[PDB]
Design a protein around this ligand. Structure first.
Ligand SMILES: CNc1nccc(-c2n[nH]c3nc(N4CCC(C)(N)CC4)cnc23)c1Cl
Length: 489
C-alpha cells in the first residue's frame, strides 16, 4: 500500500523504471515539479508509457481525463476496482511498481547520529519506540534503535543493518530489497535476543510533537533550503491507512446529492438525517467543540442542508468559498438576501442583517421550521471571501481574526451544536480552517508551553473525512497561522 508513489524520481527515471522493471499494466505516481501541486500517473501500455496529469490547486485531486478525488490512494483504488473508466482506450492499472525510497517513512531519520538517537529514545520514547538512521561508522549501512521496558527497567537496544548489493539485512537470515521491507518484516515477527527480550516494533519515535512556545524555531527548521516537504510527504504516505468504507454515498439513490461523485463521506462518521432520506455529503469532525465538514450546497441539496443545520442544532456557519470561482459554481446561494425571507422545504430562513467586514461578510439568519413557529434560532453565517483562487493567502491575519470572531460567537451560544464549515468539495479549505481552529483552541485553553502536533492532528481529522488539508501550501499555512497566533500574545 502506497508503495507506488515515488517522491524523488524524474520523468526520465519513471519511464526507465516502467520499461526495465515493469510489464504491461505496471504504474507509478510521482510529484510533477513543474507546477507546485501537480502529480503524474505513469502507466505502461503496449510497451510504451503514458502519463496522465493530476492537478491539485487546493480543492481536490483533478485527474485530467478522469474524475476528481480526495486523495491519491482513493484515486488508485477507484481504478483498480473499476477497469473501464480511465481511457486515453482503457488504461488498466494492474501492478504497482513499488518504491524503495525510505524518505516518506515515519521511522526513518536520515542524517541522525547515534548519541542524539539515544537521547530522543530515552526522553520522548516508550516501550516499542523505534527509529532507523544512517550509519556514521559504515557509510551505506544503517542502525535500528528500539526501546524496551515499562531506574533500569528500560533500555535501548541497537541493531546494525548493512546494505550489500542493493539488499538489506540484520546480519543473518533473509536479505530484503528495501529498508521498509525489512522494517515491515520485523514489525510482524520481531527479533528475539539470546536471554529472552524481544525487540518489539510498535510506534515510530515521535519527531513532530513540539512545544507551542518555541514554534518559531521549528518553522526555521522546516524552512531552510526540504523539511516542510519531508514532514508533509510522510503524512501523505499514511493516507492508505484511511481507506474507510464510503458505500452510503455510492448508492444509486444518493449519486446526484454529491457535487463530485467520488468525494464521499465516510460511513462511520457521516451526518445521518433522521426525521425520509438520510444522506447528506457531510461528516462530523471531532478533535469541547465539534465541527461539520460538508461540500458546497447543490441546488438539489439545499433543503437537505438546512435539515442538517436544524437537526445538529448548529448556530454558526463558516463559508470559505465564493458561489462561483473561475468558471463553475463552487456553492449555491442557500441564504435569502438581506431583509428577505425564504422557505427551504419545511425550513424557513430570514436574513436579518448583513454585517460586511474586511475579510468576510457576517449574516445573521433566523432559522425556523414551518408550523409551530417558535422553532426560531439564530444561525450566524460567516462568509470568508479574501481567499485566493489558487494557493493560500500570503498573511494568516485575515483568517486568524475570522476564526477568533467565529470562536466567540460559538462560545457565546451555550447550546450550539457543531460549527458548519464548508467550501466546494469540503476537504481543502474546510480542512485547513478546521485544523487551525483545533490547534488554536489547544493553545487557547492550555496556554503556551503546551504540546502541539500538527501532522498527528491532520491525520486524526483525515480519519473522519477523506483528504482534509489538500496541499503542502495549506500545510505550510497551518504552521504559519499558528506561529503568527503565538507571537501575537
Ligand atoms: C498516525 N499518523 C501520524 N501521527 C503522528 C505524526 C505523523 C507524521 N506525519 N509526518 C511526519 N514526519 C516525521 N519525521 C520527519 C520526516 C522523516 C525525517 N522522514 C521522518 C520523521 C515524524 N512523524 C510524522 C503521522 Cl503520519
Amino acid at each position: 500500500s502506497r508503495r507506488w508513489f515515488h517522491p524523488n524520481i524524474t520523468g526520465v527515471e519513471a519511464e526507465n523504471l516502467l520499461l526495465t522493471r515493469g510489464v504491461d499494466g505496471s504504474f507509478l505516481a510521482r510529484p510533477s515539479k513543474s507546477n507546485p501541486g501537480d502529480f503524474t500517473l505513469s502507466v505502461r501500455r503496449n510497451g510504451a508509457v503514458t502519463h496522465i496529469k493530476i492537478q491539485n490547486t487546493g480543492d481536490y485531486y483533478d485527474l485530467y481525463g478522469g474524475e476528481k478525488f480526495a486523495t491519491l490512494a482513493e484515486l488508485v483504488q477507484y481504478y483498480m476496482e473499476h477497469h473501464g473508466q480511465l481511457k486515453e482506450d482503457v488504461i488498466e492499472l494492474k501492478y504497482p511498481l513499488n518504491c524503495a525510497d525510505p524518505t516518506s517513512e515515519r521511522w526513518f531519520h536520515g542524517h541522525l547520529s547515534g548519541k542524539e538517537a539515544e537521547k530522543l529514545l530515552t526522553e520522548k520514547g516508550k516501550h516499542g519506540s523505534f527509529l532507523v538512521r544512517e550509519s556514521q561508522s559504515h557509510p551505506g549501512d544503517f542502525v535500528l534503535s528500539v526501546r524496551t521496558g515499562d531506574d533500569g527497567k528500560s533500555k535501548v537496544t541497537h541493531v546494525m543493518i548493512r546494505c550489500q548489493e542493493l539488499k538489506y539485512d540484520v546480519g543473518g537470515g533473509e536479505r530484503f530489497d528495501s529498508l521498509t521491507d525489512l522494517v515491515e518484516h520485523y514489525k510482524k515477527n520481531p527479533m528475539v535476543e539470546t536471554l529472552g527480550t524481544v525487540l518489539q516494533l510498535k510506534q515510530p519515535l515521535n519527531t513532530t510533537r513540539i512545544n507551542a512556545a518555541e514554534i518559531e524555531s521549528r518553522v526555521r527548521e522546516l524552512s531552510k533550503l526540504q523539511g516542510f516537504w519531508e514532514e508533509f510527504e510522510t503524512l501523505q504516505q499514511q493516507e492508505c491507512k484511511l481507506l474507510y468504507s464510503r458505500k452510503e454515498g455510492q448508492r444509486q439513490e444518493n449519486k446526484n446529492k454529491n457535487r463530485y461523485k467520488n468525494i464521499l463521506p465516510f460511513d462511520h462518521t457521516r451526518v445521518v438525517l433522521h426525521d425520509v432520506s438520510d444522506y447528506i455529503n457531510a461528516n462530523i469532525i471531532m478533535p469541547k467543540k465539534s465541527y461539520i465538514a460538508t461540500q458546497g450546497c447543490l441546488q438539489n441539496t439545499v433543503n437537505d442542508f438546512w435539515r442538517m443545520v436544524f437537526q445538529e442544532n448548529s448556530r454558526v456557519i463558516v463559508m470559505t468559498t465564493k458561489e462561483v470561482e473561475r468558471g463553475k459554481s463552487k456553492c449555491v446561494k442557500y441564504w435569502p438576501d438581506e431583509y428577505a425571507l425564504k422557505e427551504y422545504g419545511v425550513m424557513r430562513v430570514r436574513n436579518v442583517k448583513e454585517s460586511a467586514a474586511h475579510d468576510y461578510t457576517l449574516r445573521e439568519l433566523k432559522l425556523s421550521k414551518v408550523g409551530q413557529g417558535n422553532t426560531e434560532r439564530t444561525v450566524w453565517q460567516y462568509h470568508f471571501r479574501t481567499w485566493p483562487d489558487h494557493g493560500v493567502p500570503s498573511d494568516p491575519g485575515g483568517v486568524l481574526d475570522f476564526l477568533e470572531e467565529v470562536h466567540h460567537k460559538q462560545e457565546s451560544i451555550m447550546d450550539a451544536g457543531p460549527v458548519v464549515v464548508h467550501c466546494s468539495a469540503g476537504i481543502g479549505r474546510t480542512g485547513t480552517f478546521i485544523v487551525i481552529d483545533i490547534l488554536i483552541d489547544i493553545i487557547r485553553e492550555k496556554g503556551v508551553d503546551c504540546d502541539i502536533d500538527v501532522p498527528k492532528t491532520i491525520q486524526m481529522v483525515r480519519s473522519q473525512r477523506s483528504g482534509m488539508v489538500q496541499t503542502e501550501a495549506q500545510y505550510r499555512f497551518i504552521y504559519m497561522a499558528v506561529q503568527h497566533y503565538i507571537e501575537t500574545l
